[PDB]
Design a protein around this ligand. Structure first.
Ligand SMILES: [Zn+2]
Ligand SMILES: [Zn+2]
Ligand SMILES: [Zn+2]
Lengths: 1127, 68, 44
RNA sequence: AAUCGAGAG
């Protein structure tokens, strides 16, 4: 029957009785899923999540005792496990909204256990050494609201359906912004000129792979190519870089000979000349450069000695041991330990691609293309920085032991009291520094995480509107370094981003083209898939093992799983294998092959991308559902996989043999807010972007828990209605629980003449009925301990008495402790009174604001510690009523923003046959330039829905040209008995006569924005120039261009009044010191009667910046013959 | 938070919210017939009863003066 | 007399001391309560 | 008083 529905009964039932089972609209849960999944996989993994793995692989920091080849005893400090602690104390749980009302942080507690092995397995001293309080994530594993019913959430002072990856620190609710980086285990080719500019003989070419350890730790490994003919491996450790020849590492990885390297780089391509000559040049160069380095152990020792302070190696460490450690830790880290046999096999593949890049047989790969892009989640960065801080903490205890050895000379290395002395002298504020990182966004580390930004990783994550709040969790940022970059091509909307990033949702302005948003129904796999058995089934098909036979080059389809070369096969067989693997992945009924397996087969290409089949179990890769034609079952596809897949956007357009997938619901390639726009297929793309940017600026419905949500600003809209033309999935996302805007009876008519460009007019009566009554909630913190220190209680405390404090303060500052809740605070009103003993009298706090407000909620905050004292900490909330005056920006859902031109009186407003007087008037001239047919269609469908009672759905790509929405809604209007085109006849409100033509009138959804400014001064605050600031009663600066405009008109006196309104002898002051009863005279030292000074100085008219300039030059030691004019 | 007075026209509709709910739930109807029997003819009136999110039920159970 | 608990929601009073301590909860957060005070207004 | 972030024109 009906295409959509309001579901009023369901909405009211849900409002009255929150569900006690699985929450409704699950899509929101699997829309905030990536953050929750990341934070859970940080601890909820196969073996201690990722934190235990990371701390296990942190290292074995060792220092040696000075006990007289031996030196003393070791320390072998390690870390065993990291635990969870959500509540806070006699132990009690602490739910969120705490430290929200307190305006503090919602932190957990970090349990840390370490080792004190004095030597190899002799005396191990385990100890739990908890380090501060970790700021945990809401709705995550480490939160009391982990798996709660919506009813339980309602019970625990929480939003009826609350979800969020934001961290509550200082009561600010910040969030880790997502970042997008290179892939994990894929070596790509780069032709950036910076490689050539690195130094002499450097080329533009070079392979790059951003490998990641099983704890998701990045490590770059670049292969620059030199013009002479040698290839130089490059990496980075600490904050610096260290470069080494490639063949050095090739020979160090395994006990393998040069002819084997020849076969590895060139397989059956002996008749090639370019490759063979380049390889022979490389081998001869290595042989002549390092003749002594023959033995594999010898080259290992060479590496160890070349890198001894580079890796902070312990003095008791053999050179072979150090070399093995460095080539196990810093190169091809994603292959892990004991995989050196494959690490040697990977470089032979990486080199051959580089020579293919040199010869041009392979095309480069765009770093900013989504094929090779990849997003790391908030949780992963949290774990990475935590591991870095733990490693730094171990380094710090090592340094403290070193200092004690240097000076203290009181060492035991086997005494618990000694351990206590050591630990008591180091910092255990790991949680505190994590809180600082969340609060500021300033990343500080030694390794640098192979990132590129420094400052800015946490966004405030405001909740102006529910739309903006939910959008905070879907934005992916390219990088602040890219933001500083001025190249346009990075900001292009690449086709490869089809189905992953929203083509529409993008802020307009400076960050345009950068803050992309993921499409809805796009998931990030925050979990390593079961990739163990994949090689086994892969060997089942027709392949060859990576070790039995040697064959390289693009002529053979390389096969690798997450960076492990495992097989080589022809390209035809590679395509067959890719298709069969697709069959078995979507078909199920296979112990391995998870459905979310990103598999990419690049066919052989003429001068194209480098061939070879690829598989990616992945740990942060992007995923996207899509139907699979041969089985009509859901299939998952990634970006790298998509480029060579023949998707069809509709089942209608599925051709023969040119399609295998069809993304059902083509609306899925879009942001949530973009899908919320009605009839996005009838507007102009800039207008769609304007709408997306405007919706996040709305006077929204922040939530329902606003009773206790003390924050800086809320912008709560008092009323609100569902859209009569609501898009489908508006209800499916539970957006109805956060309605904003109102249905307005709009009239596309040029009547008043007070609206030509973008202005609009509201009906004065409709405003008086309360058309839109958004209100502002503002809280600020008031306390007296900001200057108080720990051991010094303040002489001043709340209240007031036993003084001669001014009367009339009991107007609103009337109680023993605080003002009344219900009061109308004017400017300068007594906000709160504190009795002070320092002055032995009470003092009060002024309002210090602009608009008079009403107190909404005053709450008492207690110290987290047992600091009973006198509770010198109070938080109060201001309620501000924002009735829509003129100039307040309203807008529709199509970017047709405008300001309230004038509250047109109802009688003068034009009316219709039915007697309805439209409330919102817009000028028809906007549309021909704006080109938003969506506004017209929304008006038409809104009238039809308001008449028939039904709800109209506005989903893009549901009206074919043969099913025109104009005709579809005209049929409904005709059957309802109204004008087919919506043109309702109307009569003027002043003359009372009928208008020339029937007016286009309908109902549309209208949103109020928060951009509500005027400043004026005559005298007051003041180089003697007026101060800067609207709120400081300042002035306005007359800029240089304003001065030029003053000159251009030739208005000399005008310029003088806008920029305004001496020692006679020296001409470059000093005067006015009367002695007894004489008038003021001059005694300029630079120059009784003239004592010796001078008596030549008279008043002149000059700016008072001149005296400051004179004094500055006097300090500068520079003086000029300032020719003082005569009388 | 039912709009007491019609924004555009001015017909009182605050009283009619409960009646609309009863007519929708107790007796099986549709919204159009429910509004018709309720006595609303112009869509300027029909808005504030066809579309009104009752954000007092969800917004109200967070009472501070009663034990949870 | 005032200062609702906001955790157990019980009215109480202060004695210049231990404003944290809700005698029934001990929760360190207190919330003030509206009293009978005249508040003039405008119906517009 | 400076720095960063949000913006608006
Ligand atoms: Zn002089
Ligand atoms: Zn009406
Ligand atoms: Zn209590």
């Amino acid at each position: 029957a009906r295409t959509a529905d309001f579901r009023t009964l369901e909405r009211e039932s849900r409002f009255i009785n929150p569900p006690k089972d699985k929450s409704a609209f699950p899509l929101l849960q699997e829309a905030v899923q990536p953050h929750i999944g990341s934070f859970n996989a940080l601890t909820e993994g196969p073996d201690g999540g990722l934190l235990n793995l990371g701390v296990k692989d942190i290292g074995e920091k060792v220092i040696f005792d000075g006990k007289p080849g031996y030196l003393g005893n070791k320390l072998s400090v390690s870390v065993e496990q990291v635990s969870i602690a959500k509540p806070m104390s006699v132990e009690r749980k602490v739910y969120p909204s705490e430290s929200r009302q307190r305006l503090t942080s919602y932190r957990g507690k970090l349990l840390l256990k370490l080792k004190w092995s004095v030597n190899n397995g002799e005396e191990n001293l385990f100890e739990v050494r908890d380090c501060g309080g970790l700021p945990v994530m809401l709705q995550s594993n480490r939160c009391h609201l982990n798996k709660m019913s919506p009813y339980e959430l309602v019970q625990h002072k929480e939003e009826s359906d609350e979800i969020g990856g934001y961290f509550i620190v200082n009561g600010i609710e910040k969030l880790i912004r997502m970042l997008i980086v290179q892939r994990r285990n894929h070596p790509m080719a780069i032709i950036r000129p910076s490689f050539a500019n690195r130094g002499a003989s450097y080329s533009h070419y070079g392979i790059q792979i951003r490998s990641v350890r099983p704890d998701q730790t990045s490590q770059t490994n670049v292969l620059h190519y030199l013009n002479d003919g040698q290839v130089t491996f490059r990496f980075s450790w600490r904050k610096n870089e260290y470069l080494v020849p490639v063949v050095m590492i090739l020979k160090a990885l395994c006990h393998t000979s040069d002819r084997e390297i020849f076969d590895g780089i060139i397989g059956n391509d002996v008749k090639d000349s370019f490759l063979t000559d380049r390889l022979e040049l490389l081998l001869r160069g290595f042989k002549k450069r390092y003749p002594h380095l023959q033995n594999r152990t010898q080259v290992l020792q060479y590496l160890g000695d070349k890198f001894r302070v580079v890796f902070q190696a312990s003095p008791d460490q053999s050179d072979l041991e150090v070399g093995q450690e460095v080539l196990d830790r810093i190169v091809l880290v994603h292959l892990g330990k004991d995989g050196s046999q494959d690490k040697f096999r990977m470089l032979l593949f990486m080199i051959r691609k580089l020579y293919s890049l040199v010869a041009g047989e392979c095309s480069p790969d765009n770093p900013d293309a989504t094929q090779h892009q990849e997003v790391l989640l908030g949780g992963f960065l949290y774990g990475m920085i935590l591991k870095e801080k733990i490693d730094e903490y171990l380094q710090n205890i090592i340094a403290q032991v070193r200092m004690d050895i240097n000076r203290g000379m009181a060492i035991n290395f086997k005494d618990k009291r000694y351990m206590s002395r050591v630990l008591m002298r180091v910092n255990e504020n790991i949680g505190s520094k994590m809180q600082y990182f969340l609060s500021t966004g300033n990343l500080v580390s030694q390794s640098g995480l192979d990132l590129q930004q420094v400052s800015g990783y946490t966004v405030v994550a405001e909740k102006i509107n529910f739309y903006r709040f939910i959008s905070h969790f879907r934005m992916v940022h390219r990088g602040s370094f890219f933001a500083q970059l001025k190249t346009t091509t990075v900001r292009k909307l690449l086709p490869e981003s089809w189905g992953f990033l929203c083509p529409v949702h993008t802020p307009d302005g400076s960050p345009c083209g950068l803050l992309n948003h993921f499409a809805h129904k796009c998931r990030i796999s925050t979990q390593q898939s079961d990739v163990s058995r994949i090689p086994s089934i892969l060997y089942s098909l027709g392949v060859a093992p990576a070790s039995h036979t040697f064959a390289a080059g693009p002529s053979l389809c390389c096969v690798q799983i997450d960076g492990k070369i495992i097989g080589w096969v022809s390209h035809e067989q590679g395509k067959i294998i890719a298709d069969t693997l697709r069959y078995w992945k979507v078909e199920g009924k296979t112990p391995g092959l998870p459905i979310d397996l990103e598999i990419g087969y690049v066919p052989p290409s003429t001068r194209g991308q480098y061939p070879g089949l690829y598989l990616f179990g992945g740990h942060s890769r992007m995923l996207r559902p899509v139907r699979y034609l041969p089985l009509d079952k859901e299939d998952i596809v990634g970006p790298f996989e998509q480029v060579y897949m023949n998707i069809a956007v509709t089942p209608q357009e599925i051709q023969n043999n040119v399609h295998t997938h069809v993304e059902f619901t083509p609306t899925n390639i879009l942001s949530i807010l973009a899908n919320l726009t009605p009839f996005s297929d009838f507007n102009q793309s800039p207008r769609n972007m304007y709408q997306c940017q405007m919706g996040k600026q709305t006077m929204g419905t922040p939530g329902v828990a606003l009773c206790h949500r003390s924050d800086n600003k809320l912008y709560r809209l008092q009323t609100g209605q569902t859209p009569i033309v609501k898009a489908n999935l508006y209800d499916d996302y539970g957006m109805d629980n956060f309605p904003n805007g109102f249905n307005a009876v709009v009239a596309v008519i040029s009547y008043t003449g007070y609206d030509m460009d973008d202005a609009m007019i509201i009906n004065k009566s409709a405003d008086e009925r309360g058309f839109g009554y958004g209100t502002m909630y503002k809280t600020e913190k008031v306390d007296l301990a900001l200057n108080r220190n720990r051991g010094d209680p303040i002489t001043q405390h709340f209240g007031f008495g036993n003084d001669e404090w001014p009367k009339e303060w009991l107007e609103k500052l009337d109680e023993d402790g605080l003002p009344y809740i219900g009061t109308y605070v004017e400017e300068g009103d007594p906000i709160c009174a504190y009795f002070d003993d320092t002055l032995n009298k009470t003092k009060i706090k002024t309002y210090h604001s602009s608009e008079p407000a009403y107190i909404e909620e005053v709450n008492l905050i207690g110290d987290e510690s047992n600091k009973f004292q006198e509770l010198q900490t109070v938080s109060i909330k201001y309620r501000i009523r924002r009735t829509p005056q003129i100039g307040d920006k309203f807008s529709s859902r199509h970017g047709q923003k405008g300001v309230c031109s004038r509250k047109w009186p109802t009688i003068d407003m034009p009316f219709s046959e039915t007697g309805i007087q439209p409330d919102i008037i817009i000028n028809p001239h906007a549309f021909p330039s704006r080109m938003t047919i969506g506004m017209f269609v929304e008006s038409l469908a809104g009238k039809a829905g308001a008449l028939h009672g039904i709800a109209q759905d506005s989903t893009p790509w549901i009206f074919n040209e043969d099913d025109t929405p104009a005709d579809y809604f005209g049929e409904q209007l005709a059957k309802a008995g109204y004008n087919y085109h919506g043109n309702e006849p109307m009569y003027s409100g002043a003359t009372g006569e009928e208008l020339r033509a029937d007016i286009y009138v309908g109902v549309v959804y209208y949103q109020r924005l928060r951009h509500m400014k005027f400043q004026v001064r005559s005298t007051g605050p003041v180089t003697m120039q007026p101060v800067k600031g609207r709120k400081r009663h300042g002035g306005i600066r007359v800029g240089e261009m304003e001065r030029d405009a003053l000159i251009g008109h030739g208005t000399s006196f005008l310029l003088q009044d806008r920029l305004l309104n001496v020692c006679r002898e020296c001409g470059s002051t000093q005067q006015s010191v009367p002695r007894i009863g004489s008038i003021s005279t001059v005694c300029c030292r630079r120059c009784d009667s003239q004592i010796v000074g001078g008596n030549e100085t008279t008043t002149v008219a000059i700016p008072f910046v001149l005296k400051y300039l004179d004094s500055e030059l006097s300090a500068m030691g520079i003086r000029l013959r300032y020719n003082v004019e005569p009388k | 938070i039912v709009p007491v007075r019609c924004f555009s026209c001015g017909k009182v509709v605050g009283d009619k919210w409960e009646s609309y709910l009863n007519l929708l739930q107790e007796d099986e109807l549709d919204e159009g017939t429910a509004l018709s029997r309720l006595g609303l003819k112009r869509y300027c009136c029909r808005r504030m009863i066809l579309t009104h999110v009752d954000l007092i039920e969800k917004f109200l159970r967070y009472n501070p003066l009663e034990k949870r | 007399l005032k200062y609702i608990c906001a955790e157990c929601s019980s009215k109480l009073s202060l004695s210049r001391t231990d404003a944290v301590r809700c005698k029934d909860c001990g929760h360190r957060i207190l919330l003030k309560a509206r009293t009978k005070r005249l508040v003039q207004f405008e119906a517009r």
